[PDB]
């Protein structure tokens, strides 16, 4: 397990994320997604 994913390094990052939430709608929700039809087809 990498350092960031355990103990208080994780706790710290998680706390920061709760109190300083990023714009997930813009950061992730705007980025293209595969068509649900294509999910079992070529990648």
């Amino acid at each position: 397990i990498p350092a960031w994913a355990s103990g208080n390094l994780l706790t710290q990052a998680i706390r920061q994320q709760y109190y300083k939430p990023i714009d997930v709608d813009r950061m992730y929700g705007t980025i293209d997604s595969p068509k649900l039809e294509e999910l079992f087809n070529k990648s």
Partner: protein, 271 residues
């Protein structure tokens, strides 16, 4: 579009029937999330492709503080990846098992959060149909997150016929082979409140036919330690007739909920 190389994989969070969930960090924003990984061949062999497509369609279009967020999804040659909100406090069912039962404050808070999330769904004609502790996760401050939408349906006009959910949580109308509607979630909320406060579901029995019998008779037997307020709410949700069940707004407004809930809304972005 995203790729698996865009993420630092931290550790497995849980095993699944179709693939594992991992704690992951998106590299460019150093943002911590969960990655559910599904195998394309296994899904095809089991014939659950349209089933998974339906779950993704529903969950990916829901945005509520008490519904586990699906940020996006991607695929490669062998795998489908779901980018999910990380719920730092984990499985609600593990916490219930650990404590045996929740106190009134804990339970009332969960009920307000559940009712708010379910109201959001019903506003959009989504019926959940499998509310139980095992399908709920907990956020950084212990906030309920509806996590699993496996029995969920978008039902804009037609009443439903599918028997689904979990034995102890089944509403009378499902057992009796009637059509059902969104009011099934009201019933399950009442069973959930009971299980929170007591630590066992209300119609617990050694056999499936005895459980069925208790449900359709609404054979509710309240333990003596329950407050009048909690019994009032449970009683108002566990009504045989769906139209008589306390509406979700009614749950949020119930005096026992108002008096006991310590619900906190998470911080929002943040212009």
């Amino acid at each position: 579009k995203f790729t698996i190389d865009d993420f630092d994989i931290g550790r497995p969070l849980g095993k699944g029937k179709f693939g594992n969930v991992y704690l992951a960090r998106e590299k460019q924003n150093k943002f911590i999330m969960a990655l559910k990984v599904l195998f394309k061949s296994q899904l095809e062999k089991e014939g659950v492709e349209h089933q998974l497509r339906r779950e993704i369609e529903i969950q990916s279009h829901l945005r509520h503080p008490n519904i586990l967020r699906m940020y996006n999804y991607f695929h490669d040659r062998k795998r489908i990846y779901l980018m999910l909100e990380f719920a730092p406090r984990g499985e609600l069912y593990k916490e219930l098992q650990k404590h045996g039962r929740f106190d009134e404050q804990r339970s009332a808070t969960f009920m307000e959060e559940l009712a708010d999330a379910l109201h959001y769904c019903h506003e959009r004609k989504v019926i959940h149909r499998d509310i139980k502790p095992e399908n709920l996760l907990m956020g950084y401050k212990g906030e309920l997150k509806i996590a699993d939408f496996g029995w969920s349906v978008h039902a804009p006009s037609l009443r439903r016929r599918t028997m689904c959910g979990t034995l102890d949580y089944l509403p009378p109308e499902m057992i009796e082979g009637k059509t059902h509607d969104e009011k099934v979630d009201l019933w399950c909320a009442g069973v959930l409140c009971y299980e929170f406060l007591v630590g066992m579901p209300p119609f617990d029995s050694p056999s499936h036919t005895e459980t069925h019998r208790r449900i359709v008779n609404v054979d509710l037997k309240f333990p003596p330690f329950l407050s009048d307020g909690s019994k009032d709410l449970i009683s108002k949700l566990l009504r045989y007739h769906p139209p008589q069940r306390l509406p979700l707004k009614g749950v949020m407004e119930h005096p026992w909920v108002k008096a006991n809930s310590r619900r906190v809304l998470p911080p929002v972005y943040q212009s």
